[PDB]
């Protein structure tokens, strides 16, 4: 009886809901509306062929926003790469920890929301779509140029930005990891260590990142790309300090706000990076099966007592299995007494008790 | 019946103290020294090689860091910034030990180019710094806007706690420079195998004079993994550790508890990686296991309860409505 579920789900209607699939609700018998309920709901932020990570590193933006205690997400859908020869296994690396981020401090926060981030710059310098390929192409971080009177990429570069109104933010901080070119009329021989930092002003505490690789963009020696640390930062006002290449900071932040008592995220697939990034204590990952996210609107109609590693008790009392890492309302496996001393209700001459 | 008991207990035999009844001693689950702490034995040479390991780990101590005897680093100097100090240890400490079993210290060695050796800098009347390390200057300098840098190698552990520390002021070389004449203070980590840094710069203006008070030492506590790393200083006298906290065995999740002049371990101690608890009879709750440790303290038995457990870990009850089995049963009878 009351054996763990294994699915997303919530302890009331204190719930919200992230998702990749199409969220909006596409008759005198009305068993032909295949709308589930939810659909339009004001507890889902849902984008057919976008995702949080692609709207923090892309063109194509979806303004995700939402609020809620128990927070989910729906993680679906060759793979991108800033280079013609660059390596798509550094952006398999930069999703998991993104979204090992996303998720550890969503478990702390009720609201997610972005912002865009503005930055002030000296120079005359503009910013340049570096890092693309024929579907996507990346804007945050945003790169500047060099100004057109150094005569290579060994230079010192700088700008602020502010970070404001929010409790922490998530940014990324990113290099070219290998031997970065600055053109291809260059030597061979003559390449660049990209190296990035971000600094606050007031507290003096300095985030920084230097490459570390020797692949390149060529035929011969393949595997330059960007390699990005998500860095969850207070507000304040910040330095991107570049020691060489191209300055970069961010031109996106995930914002966070209204902190909550630890409540782990919930995560559904239909890469395992997401499966990765999902992690005790801060995360639990379900390997649900009939998966559309259309069921799972029908699976978020009604709540369950108990959230645990091993799912989702619907009972709150009893349970053959003890759940672990329990939230809400979670049952025992204890057998119960058969008697106690409450239960007679007449002494017996001749029998004890 | 079963309400939460406001002590620190276990759920079975592994588990472990550190701090400062008769019973407990003969265990083998205790590491305490009286007149010291795990942040004295991190910073001074007052050091007791405190080493244990367990499932659920307890701490009793932090009192023998206080601010009544007070520490800083110079005669001017300000305790409060070795108070948030503290804080950000244990902080730090704490975190980790619910996801590691063992906890000891290690020494760090560095390679330094240079003939130039430590200095006692940070000290007071009754306490010598000696984590982190700081190596003067060069004979050849004759000021202190230098770069200096030094490698050092951690080992032997699956995560390292170090101190990154700068002196957070206007720091002075000299009494005989001029009272204009000052530096600001940076220090740096770095990760040669991974490529990331740490940085740290002074932002403060305060001193070392009765005019002008309150220039102490301010660390951050980073918990590294093992590799080859580059202290680099960019200004005034290179620091980088000579102690480390030995985090070993990863475990599932398990909160650690936290008992008791100060409050800093209290904030130290956040849900979902600590559980504090207040005023033994509190150190009563090691002669015997329980079923359940959850934030409102320890149930003592696995099946009913009037509260429900939060943050429950180990066979917690249930506040279901639930009476006995027995037909015969009428008032709490199911
Ligand atoms: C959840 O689990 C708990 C813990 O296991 C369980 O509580 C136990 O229930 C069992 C079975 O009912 C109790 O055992 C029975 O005790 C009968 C005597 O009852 C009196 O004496 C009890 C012993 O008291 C001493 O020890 C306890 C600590 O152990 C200590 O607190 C006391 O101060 C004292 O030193 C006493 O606990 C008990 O008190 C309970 O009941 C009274 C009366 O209703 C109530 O007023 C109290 O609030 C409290 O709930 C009472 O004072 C004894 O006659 C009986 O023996 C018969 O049955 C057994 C088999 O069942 C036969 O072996 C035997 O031959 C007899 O036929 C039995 O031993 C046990 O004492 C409880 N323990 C505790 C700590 O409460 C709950 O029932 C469980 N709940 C659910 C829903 O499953
Ligand atoms: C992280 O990356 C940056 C960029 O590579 C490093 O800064 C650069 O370090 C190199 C090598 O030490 C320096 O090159 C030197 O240039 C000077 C001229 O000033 C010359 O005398 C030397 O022979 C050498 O060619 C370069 O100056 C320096 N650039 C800047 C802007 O500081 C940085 O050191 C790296 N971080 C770490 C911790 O290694
Ligand atoms: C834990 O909670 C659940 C749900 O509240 C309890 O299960 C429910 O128990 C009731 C009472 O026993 C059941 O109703 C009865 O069912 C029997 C047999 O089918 C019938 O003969 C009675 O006339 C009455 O309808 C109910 O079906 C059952 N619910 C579910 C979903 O299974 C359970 O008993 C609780 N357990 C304990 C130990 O408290
Ligand atoms: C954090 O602290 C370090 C150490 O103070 C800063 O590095 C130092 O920055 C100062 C101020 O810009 C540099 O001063 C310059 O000195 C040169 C000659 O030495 C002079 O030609 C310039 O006009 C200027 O006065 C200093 O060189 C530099 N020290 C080193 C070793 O690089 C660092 O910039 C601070 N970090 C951040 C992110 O602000
Ligand atoms: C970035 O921020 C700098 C402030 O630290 C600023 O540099 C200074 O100019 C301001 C403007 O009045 C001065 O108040 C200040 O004295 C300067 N810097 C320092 C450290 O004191 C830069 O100008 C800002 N960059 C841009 C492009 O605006
Ligand atoms: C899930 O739980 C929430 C919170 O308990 C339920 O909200 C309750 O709604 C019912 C009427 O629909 C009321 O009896 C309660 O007073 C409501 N709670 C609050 C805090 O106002 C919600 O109904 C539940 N969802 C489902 C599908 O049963
Ligand atoms: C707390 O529980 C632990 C583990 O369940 C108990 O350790 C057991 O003790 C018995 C009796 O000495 C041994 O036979 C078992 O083999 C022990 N198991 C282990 C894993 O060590 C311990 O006795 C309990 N403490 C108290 C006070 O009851
Ligand atoms: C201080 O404690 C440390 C840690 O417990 C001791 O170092 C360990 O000693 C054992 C052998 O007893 C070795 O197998 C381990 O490799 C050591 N640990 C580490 C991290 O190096 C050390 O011996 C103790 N020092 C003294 C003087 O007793
Ligand atoms: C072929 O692609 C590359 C190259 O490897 O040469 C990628 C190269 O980008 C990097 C990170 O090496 C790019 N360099 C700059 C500074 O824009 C560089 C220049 O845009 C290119 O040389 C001029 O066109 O283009
Ligand atoms: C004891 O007071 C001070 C001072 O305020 O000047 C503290 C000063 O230390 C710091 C961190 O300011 C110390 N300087 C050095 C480089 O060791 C400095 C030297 O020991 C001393 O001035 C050398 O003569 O002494
Ligand atoms: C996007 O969302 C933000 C944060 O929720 C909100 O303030 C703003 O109205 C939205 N922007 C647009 C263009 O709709
Ligand atoms: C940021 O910019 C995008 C597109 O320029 C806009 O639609 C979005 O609402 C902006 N965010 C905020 C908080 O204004
Ligand atoms: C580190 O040094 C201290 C003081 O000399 C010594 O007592 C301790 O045993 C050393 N630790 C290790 C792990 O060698
Ligand atoms: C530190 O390590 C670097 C790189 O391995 C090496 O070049 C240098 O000689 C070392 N410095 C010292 C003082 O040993
Ligand atoms: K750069
Ligand atoms: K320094």
């Not at 204190?14 to 709901?41: I, M």
């Not at 390149?216 to 595997?223: D, M, S």
Request: hydrophobic fraction near 35%; glycine fraction near 6%; include cysteine.
């Amino acid at each position: 009886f009351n054996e763990p579920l294994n699915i997303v789900s919530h302890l009331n209607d204190d719930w919200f809901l992230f998702g990749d699939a199409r969220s909006d609700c596409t008759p005198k018998l009305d068993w032909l509306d295949l709308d589930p309920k939810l659909c339009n709901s004001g507890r889902i932020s849902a984008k057919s062929g976008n995702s949080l990570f692609r709207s923090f590193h892309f063109i194509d933006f979806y303004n995700y926003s939402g609020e809620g205690d128990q927070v989910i997400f729906y993680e679906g859908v060759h793979g991108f790469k800033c280079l013609a020869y660059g390596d798509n296994k550094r952006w398999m690396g930069n999703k998991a920890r993104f979204y090992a981020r996303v998720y550890e401090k969503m478990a702390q926060y009720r609201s997610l929301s972005f912002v865009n981030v503005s930055y002030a710059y000296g120079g005359n310098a503009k910013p340049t779509s570096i890092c693309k390929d024929k579907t996507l192409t990346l804007n945050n971080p945003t790169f500047i140029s060099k100004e057109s009177n150094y005569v290579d990429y060994y230079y010192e570069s700088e700008a602020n930005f502010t970070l404001q109104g929010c409790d922490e933010f998530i940014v990324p901080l990113c290099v070219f990891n290998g031997h970065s070119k600055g053109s291809s009329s260059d030597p061979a021989n003559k390449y660049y260590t990209d190296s990035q930092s971000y600094y606050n002003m007031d507290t003096g505490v300095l985030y920084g990142f230097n490459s570390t690789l020797d692949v390149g963009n060529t035929v011969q020696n393949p595997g330059l790309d960007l390699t990005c640390r998500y860095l969850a930062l207070t507000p304040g006002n910040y330095k991107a300090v570049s020691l060489e290449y191209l300055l970069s900071l961010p031109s996106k932040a995930i914002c966070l706000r209204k902190p909550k008592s630890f409540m782990p995220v919930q995560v559904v697939d239909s890469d395992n990076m997401t499966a990765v990034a999902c992690q005790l204590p801060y995360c639990f990952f379900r390997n649900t099966s009939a998966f559309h996210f259309r069921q799972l609107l029908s699976g978020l109609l009604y709540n369950v007592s108990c959230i645990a590693q091993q799912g989702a008790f619907v009972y709150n009392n009893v349970s053959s299995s003890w759940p672990a890492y329990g939230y809400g309302h979670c049952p025992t496996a204890a057998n119960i007494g058969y008697m106690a001393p409450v239960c007679i209700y007449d002494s017996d001459p001749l029998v004890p008790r």
